[PDB]
Design an enzyme around this catalytic site. Structure first.
Site, short mmCIF file in Angstrom:
data_model
loop_
_atom_site.label_atom_id
_atom_site.label_comp_id
_atom_site.label_asym_id
_atom_site.label_seq_id
_atom_site.Cartn_x
_atom_site.Cartn_y
_atom_site.Cartn_z
N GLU A 70 21.45 8.10 -22.06
CA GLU A 70 21.48 7.30 -23.28
C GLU A 70 20.61 6.06 -23.12
O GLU A 70 20.10 5.55 -24.12
CB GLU A 70 22.89 7.04 -23.79
CG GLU A 70 23.88 6.23 -23.06
CD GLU A 70 25.20 6.28 -23.80
OE1 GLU A 70 25.26 6.97 -24.83
OE2 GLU A 70 26.16 5.58 -23.42
N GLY A 74 0.79 -1.22 0.00
CA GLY A 74 0.00 0.00 0.00
C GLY A 74 0.82 1.28 0.00
O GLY A 74 0.61 2.16 -0.83
N1 LIG Z 1 12.80 -9.25 -2.99
C1 LIG Z 1 12.21 -8.76 -1.90
N2 LIG Z 1 10.84 -8.67 -1.83
C2 LIG Z 1 10.24 -8.17 -0.73
C3 LIG Z 1 11.00 -7.75 0.34
N3 LIG Z 1 10.15 -7.30 1.29
C4 LIG Z 1 8.88 -7.44 0.85
N4 LIG Z 1 8.92 -7.98 -0.41
C5 LIG Z 1 7.77 -8.31 -1.28
O1 LIG Z 1 7.02 -7.16 -1.61
C6 LIG Z 1 5.64 -7.40 -1.39
C7 LIG Z 1 5.19 -6.71 -0.12
O2 LIG Z 1 5.36 -5.33 -0.25
P1 LIG Z 1 5.77 -4.50 1.06
O3 LIG Z 1 7.10 -3.82 0.85
O4 LIG Z 1 5.80 -5.40 2.27
O5 LIG Z 1 4.63 -3.38 1.21
P2 LIG Z 1 4.94 -2.07 2.07
O6 LIG Z 1 5.82 -1.15 1.28
O7 LIG Z 1 5.57 -2.44 3.39
O8 LIG Z 1 3.49 -1.41 2.28
P3 LIG Z 1 2.74 -1.52 3.69
O9 LIG Z 1 2.40 -2.96 3.96
O10 LIG Z 1 1.48 -0.69 3.64
O11 LIG Z 1 3.65 -0.99 4.78
C8 LIG Z 1 5.49 -8.90 -1.27
O12 LIG Z 1 5.35 -9.47 -2.55
C9 LIG Z 1 6.81 -9.30 -0.65
O13 LIG Z 1 7.15 -10.61 -1.04
C10 LIG Z 1 12.38 -7.83 0.28
O14 LIG Z 1 13.07 -7.45 1.22
N5 LIG Z 1 12.99 -8.34 -0.84
#
Ligand SMILES: Nc1nc2c(ncn2[C@@H]2O[C@H](COP(=O)(O)OP(=O)(O)OP(=O)(O)O)[C@@H](O)[C@H]2O)c(=O)[nH]1
Ligand SMILES: Nc1nc2c(ncn2[C@@H]2O[C@H](COP(=O)(O)OP(=O)(O)OP(=O)(O)O)[C@@H](O)[C@H]2O)c(=O)[nH]1
Ligand SMILES: Nc1nc2c(ncn2[C@@H]2O[C@H](COP(=O)(O)OP(=O)(O)O)[C@@H](O)[C@H]2O)c(=O)[nH]1
Ligand SMILES: Nc1nc2c(ncn2[C@@H]2O[C@H](COP(=O)(O)OP(=O)(O)O)[C@@H](O)[C@H]2O)c(=O)[nH]1
Ligand SMILES: [Mg+2]
Ligand SMILES: [Mg+2]
EC number: 3.6.5.-
Lengths: 48, 442, 48, 430, 430, 442
Positions: free
Chosen positions: F253, F143
């Site tokens: 570029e 979100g």
């Molecule tokens: N590759 C990778 N994916 C991540 C990581 N942390 C979360 N994700 C992925 O990103 C998605 C979740 O998004 P989040 O970053 O948790 O959402 P947010 O930015 O915290 O938003 P809020 O929940 O409202 O705080 C899921 O698909 C997770 O698997 C990470 O450290 N590395």
């Protein structure tokens, strides 16, 4: 004091990894076989 | 220059272990793939390149894949002495065997594993600049050897095209047997092998047992002896690529000289100074005696009798201290003999090769050390008797559909048996027709 | 530990080499001192 | 008057290596290329076979072609190999497969333009160009196919010069290759149209020379290639040294060839005699003439007693009287008069050269035009007819692309050549 | 008679640094600027490329321009970088973005006044001004757009002088930049109106030169830029040293250009030969002449065998006879007579200069006007038509402000240039 | 020269920790910002300037902001090991999360926090003299990453204008999933992101899991491994700014070469020598082998198959000991291949870059140490398949208004769903139209 031998180079990066406990029971941690091994490998230090 | 080795199933991997031990010992590569650091010959010759590639740190690595459906044999390679020689990706193993079913290997189980094999072969062939063939080792009596050998040769033949494919194949012995269903697997294998192989080398375990009993004095042979002999034969044929010599022979010359018509490509193999260490110091070993030896029926590694047929072509490989005059005198003496007959359409019946590198001596081995050896590959109509005996055993079993329900349940139409049996019958008729002597005078 | 990289293929600024104890993998390229001014100016390489 | 050499295939490159050893030795050129000779007579014709590179050095005017560098790497690794110009080594990446059609049509046309470019670069540097010299075997694959291809291209580009070939042809006894009849027939078809003069050698005759005349216990290809290099270097000797009666390749062709298809010749070299006997009998023109006509000393399997001489030539090297030469050639022609074709009043040409090969007081090389060569071609045609009726190995050649009509044409041309030799042999005048 | 140099973009600045290394070496100028030469012949024409600063020093009459200082910081760190006048380095604060319209219209008009101010300051200091020399690539962004902008301004301000360019052009096999066809077409449109003489180089041809002729295992951009610096410093040699038959850039233009649009030329430099081969072949005028016309030694992908020579020029450096030069040029014209346009009675100009470059006994640079240049322009026009029909990346250029009519004009002009070459190729006397 | 990094939410901050760890280790800055006294230089150098600024006492500080709505991750950075590296004002944290609601982040909560972020970015941009773009790290599945990332990119795009903005984006994986509402958030994010980004690079965790299982030998990977791989990719792309090379590549570029039409800005990313230390010493790694590797789907970090589409442009970045002639030979060999296809309107399909600095090896890392690497960014029509499955999942939930009351309560009109879904439908039609061959020459 890292030696330039082949086996030391092969296993040095694995030895310093930050996720060593998560590798237990897999083929990486068995020093007596090449990787992608198929046989059983123990996951407890008494058996290891 | 380069050749790629493909090892399939149990017999092919076990024979591969003997081959790579031998090729290491001839070049001087340590079991860990590093050249001896105290060796300072200085003439860092290119001959390894046929079988090895360099990483750049000076480790050697070999041009081979090991393919199996059961883990045990590949795990033996992984845990053995040669662990560091092979790249771990090169050693491919499945989950479960083809259970002596050609149908299981070809249709059900090999279809998942086959794409890894093709990706590895592509990765090898891309790291070449003068590839001149594939060497394949398998047995047609077992399930994985039949099913994956057919499927892999078909895919290789579409993808690589004109490149040559030479097979060394262990066929079911005429009275020694290991499994009940061997005739079915051998018929179904030979149907695929007819279309998709350039030269086929014939082996029978009973002949190598007889050879080890008669010439060597071994009462109780085991598979390591047979595999070491096979490795020596393969080393003899590939020696022409690797060392200096008087008369070289490129792998395309074999196909040009040995195959008269495109189906008549199944060849017999024999090796002359197979001798023990205690006998070796009592006898001289001249060229003419070993040339006479390769034509004696006590020397063949396939259970067939050449007195029941006619030769079409012979290829004679001499290695070691040999002089062309002795080869010429020997071949002319063979030609004089009355019990050796050539088809009348083949007047110039012989191909010769002469190589300077003497045969290598293996530390645990049972062969003596000798200054010269000769190896023969020959095309002869006598081979038709082996197929006739396989087909007769097939007819006996097939009259009641004795085991067919396994094959049909595991995915094969019953019709495929009759098609294959008719194709091998046509191969028998081909060998009947080619051996006809006719008078054009009409 | 750190060192300074060489400049065989060109460049003028110094570069940092990190952890020289670990030996790099892969094949090192074939190099020689043969350049284009040695060929286009040094015709007196032999004093015959 | 400079010759350009081409060495093709394994046999050709090895014989060429021995030839350039013999010639470099005769003119005293060190393997570094430095002149170390001991008479001006050596220097004054060095241009004939060598070009001069800067600050002393000499380089030999030869092109080496092969499909796998193994032979090229062996000759480059040999003791005199360094002398050869690096840009003159031409090689491919896959073999002839012992197949004429592969060597002629698939890998041939890919490389051939670079060979003609090198030959033209070498030819146009000469101030006046004499004929080309080519060594190859006819039984092989790349030797036969690319040799005849190159011959055709050079005959298109230089039709007014001389074309000379030295060629090894299959023995009836030493079967080294199964498919020898096809390659031989197709190559002879190409040669009889393209060549101006072609010399043929049987390995069996060199073996019989070594065993019977020289009594060698264990001969090797170095000896056979030394014998060949001796005759090859002898034919050109009058081109490059003074003498009382000079001769030339064109003058040889004019005196030997009565009609343009009859240009295949036998070769011999006379003072072959074992080191033990030579102390008991000195060299002289009667002795040289006796060895010269003895069939033991002739390099073909056909024997003169089954044919007739149209023409012959003898080139003598050494300090000797012309009178002895003249009376020996007259006496031999008169005494053996039935073996010489009667409508030519004198069949032998002589030539005399002042400078013998080192360590011999005198030497002669003999070239003979004899109808017994017809027996050899007949044998090759026989083996072809036995093989062709059954289509024994034809699919390889057809898969490369040859039409079957080529085989029947080449067979017909060889059969007419044999017939023409037989017709001139048995002609009569009433 | 002094030339002013301009170096633009990455390629131009890199080639220029090596050029000024070669020139400083030839006149014996220390990297501190002190004259250290060993013959008066070096000093007496030093004015041609250097201006003299106080107490010994000499400074090179060159302007360095680029849009991001990265290249300038690399050249300033080099071994000769100190020689350059600090006020002569002109740079912006953001890159060209590989876009012609950006380089020509947005940062171009921002910088152009300071470069023109420096060029005028340098020009008005000369006692008599000879032509300008410009190095740039046509495929890039700031090189093509801002180079042609500056060329247009200098042609407005000095219309009576000569304008000469050396230019790098896209290879036929692999692109280094996706939008190369647009930048090339617009730059050729600017050059064909403004330029007097334009030289073209393919990076693929330099790679093939290195691999086939020099057999280098691992060539680098330093070698390619050395070859270019060698030809660039060679063309001006007759301007600045004595000789038996002096020549000049204007004299070159008068003899090379038959009609004012036909001014695009191929370049070569002859004594290229590998360190292994050099022991095998001495330098001579026939060898240089034979190598000079071999397409292997030509620095463009088009081959002369598909076209015809309108005119050619050869400049020889060294002590040599005029007889060998005139008779060689006659013999080459006569033997290959079908490749020379027949309505011109003699196509080759020669020139001879006494002083060769140090460590070579002799050298020649070759400039050729050949109709095979039409294949390069045709190829670029094809790629342009494929891209233009679909507006593939056009919004960048239109967003900078260009009208599509510029693109249609440039395409039409290139097509007319190709047509003019084809028409003169197939013309006849009738 | 300079670039500013903006890290949003959980994935973006966690990937930031790995990135700044790597950039420190490559330049040699200690975690506390002080250059060690031993890391001396023969001549004064500026390469750090792309990522660090000095206060004048010789401490280094980085050109980055960390933005989050929940405190926990930023408090983790504040209490961790790198406490002294970051300026404390740079680390901005709110009170409560956006609870997987795009509407809550964009309308309700991010509206309070956005002005502090803009003041920090302005304070950074004032301390620059050649700013040449923004790098943004976020995930579109959550979100706050979607809502605040869009709002912040909109404000940056109005205030800074023409300056380029390059995004690294973690998209929802095709069958691995973490939350129910991912399709709604990804569609609504992508609608705003379409207008206000110049190139967007797509990542899927399922591909990096596959890569770590298949190439590396890791059975149980975790986010630190994925984040270290992403950091390596970013270091490879930004290396062209920081070290000497034959063919440098400025961020403008990329935008000029990769984007044909202003909506067609979504690109695929791959990295070649992802390999373990034990495998790396058995094989050479020549230029042509890694060039062949980057085009194989086994090398990609996004779960899409490029064989189902056509390439429009490729950008290949080589770093380490590479010579241009091998790159040219490799690209010509790739062009020869029949399973690699380019749209016929893009004849000059390739961009190259060549940098001398080889990739760095990190002490706790899982990649081997290697002398050369190549990184690819490429534009391909296959991406249309990725959008279609998200759109199908959106259609499935939205047909019944499955969750909409949360979004409507936090401030959004129902109409916004239909607008975004129609914009993504038009993007699908754009990818259909661009790939259609033009053959109406008459
Ligand atoms: N590759 C990778 N994916 C991540 C990581 N942390 C979360 N994700 C992925 O990103 C998605 C979740 O998004 P989040 O970053 O948790 O959402 P947010 O930015 O915290 O938003 P809020 O929940 O409202 O705080 C899921 O698909 C997770 O698997 C990470 O450290 N590395
Ligand atoms: N020379 C030799 N022959 C062998 C060896 N092992 C098995 N054979 C023979 O090969 C045939 C059996 O083939 P297998 O290799 O066991 O079949 P497979 O490849 O294992 O196929 P699956 O049973 O489905 O796994 C019999 O004729 C055996 O005598 C061996 O190690 N050496
Ligand atoms: N005299 C002689 N004959 C040779 C030599 N090498 C090969 N031969 C003969 O030439 C024939 C083989 O031809 P080859 O040279 O291999 O043909 P290629 O494959 O086209 O080069 C056989 O009859 C060999 O016996 C040699 O060194 N000397
Ligand atoms: N010969 C040579 N070519 C170069 C060099 N640097 C770049 N190029 C070529 O020039 C083209 C790139 O143009 P570039 O100089 O980057 O344009 P710019 O961005 O406007 O400066 C490509 O074809 C490169 O291969 C060099 O040092 N030497
Ligand atoms: Mg089994
Ligand atoms: Mg969160």
């Amino acid at each position: 004091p890292v030696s330039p031998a082949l086996a030391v180079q092969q296993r040095l990066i694995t030895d310093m990894s930050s996720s060593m406990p998560l590798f237990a029971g897999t083929a990486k941690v068995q020093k007596y076989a090449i990787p992608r091994y198929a046989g059983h490998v123990p996951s407890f230090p008494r058996n290891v | 220059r380069e050749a790629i080795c493909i090892h399939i199933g149990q017999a092919g991997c076990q024979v591969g272990n003997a081959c790579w031990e031998l090729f290491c010992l001839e070049h001087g590569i340590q079991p860990d793939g590093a050249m001896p650091s105290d060796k300072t010959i200085g003439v860092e010759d290119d001959a390894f390149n046929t079988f090895f590639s360099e990483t750049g740190a000076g480790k050697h690595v070999p041009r081979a894949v090991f393919l199996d459906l059961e883990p045990t044999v590949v795990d033996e390679v992984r845990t053995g002495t040669y662990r560091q020689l092979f790249h771990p990706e090169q050693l491919i193993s499945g989950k479960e065997d083809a259970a002596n079913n050609y149908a299981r290997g070809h249709y059900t189980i090999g279809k998942e594993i086959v794409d890894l094999c093709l990706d590895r072969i592509r990765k090898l062939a891309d790291n070449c600049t003068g590839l001149q063939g594939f060497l394949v080792y398998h047995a047609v009596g077992g399930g994985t050897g039949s099913g994956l050998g057919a499927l892999l040769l078909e895919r290789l033949s579409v993808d690589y095209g004109k490149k040559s494919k030479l097979g060394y194949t262990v066929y079911p012995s005429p009275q020694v047997s290991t499994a009940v269903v061997e005739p079915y697997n051998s018929v179904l294998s030979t149907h695929s092998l007819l279309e998709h192989t350039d030269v086929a080398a014939m082996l029978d375990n009973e002949a190598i047992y007889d050879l080890t009993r008669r010439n060597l004095d071994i009462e109780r042979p085991t598979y390591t002896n047979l595999n070491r002999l096979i490795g020596q034969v393969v080393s003899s044929l590939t020696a022409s690529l690797r060392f200096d010599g008087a008369l070289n022979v490129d792998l395309t010359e074999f196909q040009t000289n040995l195959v008269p018509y495109p189906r008549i490509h199944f060849v017999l193999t024999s090796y002359a100074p197979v001798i023990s260490a205690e006998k070796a110091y009592h006898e001289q070993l001249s060229v003419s005696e070993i040339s006479n030896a390769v034509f004696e029926p006590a020397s063949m590694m396939t259970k067939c009798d050449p007195r029941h047929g006619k030769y079409m072509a012979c290829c004679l490989m001499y290695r070691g201290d040999v002089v062309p005059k002795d080869v010429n005198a020997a071949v002319a003496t063979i030609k004089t003999k009355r019990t050796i007959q050539f088809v009348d359409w083949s007047p110039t019946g012989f191909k010769c090769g002469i190589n300077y590198q003497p045969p290598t001596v293996v530390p645990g081995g049972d062969l003596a050390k000798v200054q010269r050896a000769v190896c023969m590959i020959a095309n002869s109509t006598a081979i038709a008797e082996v197929f006739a005996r396989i087909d007769h055993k097939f007819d006996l079993m097939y009259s009641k559909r004795a085991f067919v329900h396994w094959y049909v349940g595991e995915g094969m139409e019953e019709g495929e048996f009759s098609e294959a049996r008719e194709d091998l019958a046509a191969l028998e008729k081909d060998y009947e027709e080619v051996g006809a002597e006719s008078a054009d005078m009409d | 530990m750190c060192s300074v990289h060489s400049n065989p293929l060109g460049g003028s600024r110094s570069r940092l080499h990190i952890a020289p104890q670990i030996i790099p993998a892969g094949r090192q390229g074939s190099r020689d001192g043969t350049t284009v001014r040695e060929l286009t100016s040094n015709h007196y390489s032999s004093g015959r | 008057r400079e010759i350009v050499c081409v060495q093709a295939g394994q046999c050709g490159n090895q014989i060429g290596s021995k030839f350039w050893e013999v010639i470099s030795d005769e003119h005293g050129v060190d393997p570094t290329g430095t002149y170390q000779g001991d008479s001006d007579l050596q220097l004054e014709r060095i241009n004939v076979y060598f070009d001069e590179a800067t600050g002393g050095r000499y380089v030999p005017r030869s092109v080496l072609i092969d499909l796998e560098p193994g032979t090229m790497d062996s000759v480059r690794a040999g003791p005199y190999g360094q002398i050869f110009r690096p840009d003159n080594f031409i090689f491919g990446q896959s073999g002839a497969g012992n197949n004429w059609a592969k060597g002629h049509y698939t890998e041939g046309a890919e490389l051939i333009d670079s060979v003609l470019d090198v030959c033209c670069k070498e030819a146009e540097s000469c101030d006046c160009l004499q004929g080309f010299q080519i060594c190859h075997s006819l039984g092989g694959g790349t030797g036969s196919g690319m040799g005849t291809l190159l011959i055709s291209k050079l005959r298109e580009q230089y039709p007014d010069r001389i074309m000379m070939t030295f060629s090894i042809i299959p023995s009836p006894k030493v079967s080294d290759t199964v498919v020898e009849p096809y390659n031989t027939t197709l190559s002879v078809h190409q040669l009889v149209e393209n060549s101006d003069e072609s010399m043929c050698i049987d390995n069996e005759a060199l073996y019989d020379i070594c065993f019977r005349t020289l009594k060698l216990t264990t001969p090797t290809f170095g000896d056979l290639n030394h014998l060949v290099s001796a005759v090859v270097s002898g034919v050109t000797c009058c081109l490059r040294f003074p003498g009382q009666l000079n001769s030339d390749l064109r003058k040889l062709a004019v005196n030997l060839v009565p009609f343009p298809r009859l240009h295949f010749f036998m070769m011999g070299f006379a003072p072959l005699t074992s080191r033990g006997s030579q102390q008991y009998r000195g060299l002289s023109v009667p002795e040289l003439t006796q060895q010269m006509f003895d069939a033991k000393n002739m390099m073909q399997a056909a024997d003169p007693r089954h044919g007739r001489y149209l023409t012959a030539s003898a080139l003598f090297r050494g300090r000797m009287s012309t009178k002895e030469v003249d009376e020996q050639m007259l006496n031999v022609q008169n005494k053996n008069s039935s073996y010489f074709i009667e409508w030519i009043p004198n069949n032998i040409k002589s030539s005399v050269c002042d400078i013998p090969p080192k360590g011999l007081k005198m030497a002669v090389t003999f070239i003979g035009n004899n109808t017994c060569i017809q027996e050899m071609f007949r044998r090759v045609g026989e083996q072809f007819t036995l093989m062709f009726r059954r289509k024994a190995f034809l699919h390889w050649y057809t898969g490369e692309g040859m039409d079957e009509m080529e085989f029947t044409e080449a067979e017909s041309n060889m059969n007419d050549l044999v017939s023409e030799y037989q017709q001139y042999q048995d002609a009569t005048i009433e």
